[PDB]
Amino acid sequence: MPNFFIDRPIFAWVIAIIIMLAGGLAILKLPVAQYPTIAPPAVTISASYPGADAKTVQDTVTQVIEQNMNGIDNLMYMSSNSDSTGTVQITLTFESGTDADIAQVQVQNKLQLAMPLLPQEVQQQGVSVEKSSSSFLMVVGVINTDGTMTQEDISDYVAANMKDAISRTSGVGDVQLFGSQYAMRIWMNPNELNKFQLTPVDVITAIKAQNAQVAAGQLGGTPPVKGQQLNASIIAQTRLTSTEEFGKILLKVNQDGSRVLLRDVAKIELGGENYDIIAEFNGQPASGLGIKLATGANALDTAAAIRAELAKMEPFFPSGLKIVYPYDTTPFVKISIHEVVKTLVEAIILVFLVMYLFLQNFRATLIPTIAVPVVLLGTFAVLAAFGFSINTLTMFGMVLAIGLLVDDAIVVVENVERVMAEEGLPPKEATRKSMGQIQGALVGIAMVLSAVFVPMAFFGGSTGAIYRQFSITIVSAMALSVLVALILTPALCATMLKPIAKGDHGEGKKGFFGWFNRMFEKSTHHYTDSVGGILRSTGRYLVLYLIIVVGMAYLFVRLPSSFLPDEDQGVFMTMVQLPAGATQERTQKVLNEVTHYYLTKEKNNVESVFAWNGFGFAGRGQNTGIAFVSLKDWADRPGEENKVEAITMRATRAFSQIKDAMVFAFNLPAIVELGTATGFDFELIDQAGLGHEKLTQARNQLLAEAAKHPDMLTSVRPNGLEDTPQFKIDIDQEKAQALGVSINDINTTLGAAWGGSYVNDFIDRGRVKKVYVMSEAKYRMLPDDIGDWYVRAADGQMVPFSAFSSSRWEYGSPRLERYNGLPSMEILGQAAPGKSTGEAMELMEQLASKLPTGVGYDWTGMSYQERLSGNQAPSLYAISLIVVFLCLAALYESWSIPFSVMLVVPLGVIGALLAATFRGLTNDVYFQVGLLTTIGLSAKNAILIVEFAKDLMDKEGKGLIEATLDAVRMRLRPILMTSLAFILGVMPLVISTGAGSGAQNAVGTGVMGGMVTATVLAIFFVPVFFVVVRRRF
């Protein structure tokens, strides 16, 4: 095949140029992100039953929808929750790779079956099916620099001028708004209402009558009378536009002719639609947009558009308005991508340096160095062809490939150089002679190396998505490398090299190379003699191998396990949960202390704090709060004590002293889509109908057990809410009939005053906005305020609520949760420092087994993927080993040689296990990729010996011992040079400590340690395996 391109070297260069420009074109157009779409798609169903308690909401809404949701294709698990506000959120998670649009359609089809069974007010409120994720792409905060506008004043400007543009910006999927659009608030006062003998029903009726839009037809409309000469529309009542217009709404006229206006009985002002959530930025009033990335969109492309969009509305800002970015993932993505690119460049330079040590020639070492850019760019073109995107996982693939793809070009020039030393043949004739001895070695090594990475691409789950990224990159690199080796290297070796005199071994040089060559040759002779002695006593060394295999198995079970390493993303969360029934003011007091601590004790690291009051991952509630914490640039946070893991440990330690509040600081998970916090996600399931009371006791019992193991479990907490006291008011309808008061009036008066009521819409600066009627704050705070409200009887009298009602206190859960249709309570926690999530996973299962019968458990979120990854790990190795064995046999149709080759696999695996154990790493997704790389690399070193040894017997007729000793003698230098090229190739990953180094260290350490033992042990045991196996068969 090289002979087709030796005659026409221009054709070889033309081929290389095409691959070069194909990669360059691909780079300029490929999408860029940190990770691919590896998180499983999720669909969220949102419904509302205003005013109903959590237990009532669950029975009439959640159960109705859930019972129809079974039987949906590719459904992994389903979870739901309902709270005291009447909100319903049912989340369905599908298998990874499932089409989100098809899944959303199927969910929407099933919803129509349960839609008629829901309450009418639920149907009128509207139930929405939406593709959802728990991770924000970025958070764009808006603050006022002089404090002249309140939170709702800021929120409306964001809602009116920004939300519409942002929500329809390219690639934007969802926009949560931290605040509310302006709404006309009618703060009624019961005392003046009672003075004029009015009721909230009268206020609502008057607003609807006087604030309405009425169609009135046209003048001379069709069919017109003959001779009509004018056509014009008639304009009836229109929506009110100002608070003054609302203020002078006429309610009733007194007997003396006086007019009772709306402003005489209520305060009229522009306020928010709801006041449940309060957001502050560094202790300053603020709002913002919780932008979420659409499924299938690019993180970098959308954020650049969003930042460009924000600069567009900047000229239209009111005075004092400022934009801030408390949360932004793009700086982390860019810095992580660049570090691997920096690592990639260092690998090429180091690979160039080590080869120059051996070849000691500028021109000779340049020929194989030219190959690397061609194939490296070629992998980019293959990525574009298959529809992949540039990411850290693909970035790691080329970095790992660096030690592999150069091996084919390394050994070719070695043979050509060796031919010159042995015979002084001209470079073109030496090149032609070289191929006939080497072609099998090049394809065989490339074929088996690509073979081991093929089965990994066929596995499912989020782990399989990670595996595919390494699969496409490495396999395509190997395929292109052997293509380039046959295409490009023979041409330059025949044109760009220079002859080396026959018999030249380089011992006579005066430079450092002279010392290196003489020492290298002398050490080789001693090594060969040692191998010869070993081959005479192979019985001893078989026992050593069996010890190694036993040791490898012992280390594999001793090594802890995990899913994915944590990273310093520059941001972390702190959650605050006050006891049951805590008001909004009390939670704000705790959040002020939390914000004050970060800005004083951690002013060196914390850039800004963005806190919410009334909202959290445990659900909406005045007693729940959460705060984003933004850290400075990684360049400005040197050392380990300034990292997220250290900061959160100190923050949690300090916040433990805070009384009457539970505060936890945690890092974000490895990927933000699969969960809200790092650690394990544990679900406790009632599988027999134990009820809420018994299930809560089991949850408390489990938490007590976890609290007794602080050495391996930390920050163990429930994700739900404790049972809150409830104010129950009973309306005696029999007394209502006696007093002559309509029941609907009683319900309307109670609902509108205390819970607030949405009447209709109004126009505010050309935008449609809601109108709300509610009691003033000071008249709806205590149970004694119930008697302050009156209902007008049919006879015209005013009667208070106390004359026909009674009140009492009850207890009930403010939030109920279900898992897969069964009642459940969610438990969160983290592994103690030094331990791993897998150990926490193992311990939690043991503790859960002690719970009373009828209570089960299941893992979800990150933990579910953690469990799934471990389960299919044995199948990944078993299939990969089988594939390589069959692939090796295909080269010879003999079983002895592939069996001899696979005997070195434990020699490499033990190196990866030892390296991980000494550094304290864990068996995770990255480590599993390292093992498969080590398996291929260990076989590759063996092939360099077996292939040569096999030829010397079948082609030159040398003896078994003679061929093995001879083939080992020449092949030591290619093995050492290729092994070292891999050692320094992945060394930057091992020594990396910057941003994103957690992933790099996990990948680099396993392959580096494995390759060391795959080189030191192999050069002795591989001759033992080959000799013994061929002696037996």
Author numbering: 1 to 1033
Sentences from the paper on this structure:
Resistance nodulation and cell division (RND) efflux pumps are secondary active antiporters that are ubiquitous across all domains of life. As part of tripartite multidrug efflux systems in Gram-negative bacteria, they span the entire cell envelope and export a broad variety of structurally and chemically unrelated toxic substrates. During drug efflux, AcrB undergoes a functional rotation where each of the three protomers sequentially cycles through the conformational states loose (L), tight (T) and open (O). Substrates can enter the PD through several channels and bind to the access pocket (AP) in the L state and the deep binding pocket (DBP) in the T state.
To elucidate the conformation of AcrB without the crystallisation bias, we assessed the structure of the variants by cryo-EM. In contrast, V612F and V612W mainly showed particles in the T state (72.7 % and 83.9 %, respectively), with these variants displaying trimers predominantly in the TTO (54.9 % V612F, 44.1 % V612W) and TTT (31.8 % V612F, 53.8 % V612W) states. F/W612 appears to stabilise an open DBP even in the absence of a substrate, as the bulky side chain might mimic the binding of a small substrate. Moreover, the proximity of the bulky aromatic side chains in the hydrophobic cluster might introduce a steric hindrance for the rearrangements associated with the closing of the DBP required for the O and L state formations. Indeed, our structural models of the best resolved O monomer densities show that the DBP remains partially open in V612F/W structure. We assume that the O state conformation is still feasible due to compensating interactions, such as the PC1 and PC2 subdomain proximity, and PN1 subdomain interaction with the neighbouring protomer. However, in the L state, such stabilising contacts are far less pronounced.
